[PDB]
Structure formats: C-alpha cells, structure tokens
Amino acid sequence: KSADHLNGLLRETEATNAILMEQIKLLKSEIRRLERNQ
C-alpha cells in the first residue's frame, strides 16, 4: 500500500529535476553573453 507514496514523490523529484535543467540553460547562455561583450 506504501508503493503509492513512491510515485507522487518520484514525480516531485522529477519536477524539481526539470526546473534545474531550465536554470542551467539560462545560466549557460548568460555565460556566453558575458564572453561576447569581453
């Protein structure tokens, strides 16, 4: 019966996983931007 809380929580770890990669993309382009105006 506890094999249930394993899904709702896994999807949260994947939800937080998503937003991480989004922040990463934004940072990378910010780096590329700074390097251009160098």
Partner 1 sequence: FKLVFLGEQSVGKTSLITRFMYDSFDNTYQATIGIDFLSKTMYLEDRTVRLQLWDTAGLERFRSLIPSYIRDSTVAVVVYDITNVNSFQQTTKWIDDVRTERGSDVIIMLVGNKTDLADKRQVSIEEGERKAKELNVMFIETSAKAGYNVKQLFRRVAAAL
In the complex, minimum distance from the CB of residue 4 to partner 1, in angstroms, rounded to a whole number? 19
Give least dist CB 1 to partner 1, A.
22
Query: What residue type is assigned to position 17 of the chain?
Result: N
11 binds partner 1 (CB under 8 A): no
Q: Which of 4, 26, 37, 38 binds partner 1 (CB under 8 A)?
A: 26
How far from chain centre, in Å, is Cα 26?
11
CA 6 to chain centre: 20
Residue 7 C-alpha from the chain's centroid: 19
Site for partner 1, rule CB under 8 A: 15-16, 19, 21-24, 26-28, 30-32
